[PDB]
Automatic annotation (TrEMBL), chain A:
Transmembrane segments: none annotated. It comes from Human immunodeficiency virus type 1. Homotrimer; further assembles as hexamers of trimers. Interacts with gp41 (via C-terminus). Interacts with host CALM1; this interaction induces a conformational change in the Matrix protein, triggering exposure of the myristate group. Interacts with host AP3D1; this interaction allows the polyprotein trafficking to multivesicular bodies during virus assembly. Part of the pre-integration complex (PIC) which is composed of viral genome, matrix protein, Vpr and integrase. Disulfide bonds join 52-72. The chain holds residues 279 to 362 of 500 of the full protein. Belongs to the primate lentivirus group gag polyprotein family. The lineage of its organism: Viruses, Riboviria, Pararnavirae, Artverviricota, Revtraviricetes. It is found in: Host cell membrane; Host endosome, Host multivesicular body; Virion membrane; Virion. This is Gag polyprotein.
Length: 84, 12
């Protein structure tokens, strides 16, 4: 919500949606840039849901956002409408 | 990743 500490990934929320929400909230957060970096380096992976949190830990600290996106693509999904 | 990475991704 009005705090970056309140942003956590939905149980089935696409990782890409969560990161976007996290980003939007962090931009509004009143803190130094170095602190915002610290928040991204810890809170983002920490508040991801259990399934993505596991994939992220595996990729390591050197992973890029694009690599994280690709790795969590489909977790909680596929999210397609049930084609009757 | 850092906040700057987020900025470059979505940003500017």
């Amino acid at each position: 919500p009005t705090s970056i500490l309140d942003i956590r990934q939905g149980p089935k929320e696409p990782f890409r949606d969560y990161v976007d929400r996290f980003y939007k909230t962090l931009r509004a957060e009143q803190a130094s840039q170095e602190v915002k970096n610290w928040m991204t380096e810890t809170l983002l992976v920490q508040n991801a849901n259990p399934d993505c949190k596991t994939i992220l830990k595996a990729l390591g600290p050197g992973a890029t956002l694009e690599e994280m996106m690709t790795a969590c693509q489909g977790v909680g999904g596929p999210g397609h409408k049930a084609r009757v | 990743i850092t906040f700057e990475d987020l900025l470059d991704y979505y940003g500017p």
